Amino acid sequence: GSSGSSGQKNPDSYNGAVRENYTWSQDYTDLEVRVPVPKHVVKGKQVSVALSSSSIRVAMLEENGERVLMEGKLTHKINTESSLWSLEPGKCVLVNLSKVGEYWWNAILEGEEPIDIDSGPSSG
Numbered sequence: 001g002s003s004g005s006s007g008q009k010n011p012d013s014y015n016g017a018v019r020e021n022y023t024w025s026q027d028y029t030d031l032e033v034r035v036p037v038p039k040h041v042v043k044g045k046q047v048s049v050a051l052s053s054s055s056i057r058v059a060m061l062e063e064n065g066e067r068v069l070m071e072g073k074l075t076h077k078i079n080t081e082s083s084l085w086s087l088e089p090g091k092c093v094l095v096n097l098s099k100v101g102e103y104w105w106n107a108i109l110e111g112e113e114p115i116d117i118d119s120g121p122s123s124g
Contacts, residue, residue, distance in 0.1 A: 017115055022058065022070035024108050026115055031105055035069045035093040038062075042089030049085045049095065053077040056108070058093060069093075072109030076100075 011018055016025035024033035035058050041047060048066070050057035054077045058070035074097075082098030099105070104122065106114040 015117065017113065022108075026105050026117065029099050029102070031097040031099070031108065033070070033095050033097070033108060035095070037069075037088070037090070037092055039090045041087075044087040047087055047093060049087075049093070051078075051080040051083055051085070053080060053100075054110075056095070056097075058095070072111060075105055075107050075110050076103055 010016070013023050013025050016023070022033055022035045024031060037047070037060055040063075041060050046061040048057055048059040054074045056071065056074055057068070059066050059068045077100050079098040079100050083096055085093065085095040087093050104119070
C-alpha cells in the first residue's frame with residue numbers, strides 16, 4: 001500500500017553511483033565511500049587502507065591471502081590529515097576524503113565513469 005514518497009530517488013546511496021565493488025558519493029566539500037566487508041572481517045588489520053593524496057587502497061584478508069576491494073589513483077589530491085577511515089566489523093569500511101579546496105570530483109579514481117550530477121558553466 002503506497003503511502004508517502006514513492007518512486008525511485010535512489011537505491012541506497014543518497015544520489016550517486018552504485019557498483020559491485022565500492023560505493024561512493026559526491027557532496028559539497030567531501031566524499032564518502034563505503035566498502036562492503038565479509039562477516040569474517042572485524043579487525044582493521046584484516047583490511048589495508050593506504051592514504052597519500054591522489055591514491056587510495058582498500059583490501060581485505062580472506063584466509064590464505066587477501067583481495068583488493070577498491071583501489072586506484074584518485075582523481076585529485078586530498079588532505080589525508082583531515083581525511084579518515086573507520087573499519088566496521090561485519091558491516092563495511094568507511095573512508096572520509098577531505099577535499100583540498102573547491103574541486104568537482106566527477107569520480108573517485110582516475111578511470112571511473114563520470115557521475116551524472118553536473119552544473120552549468122565551469123571551464124570558463
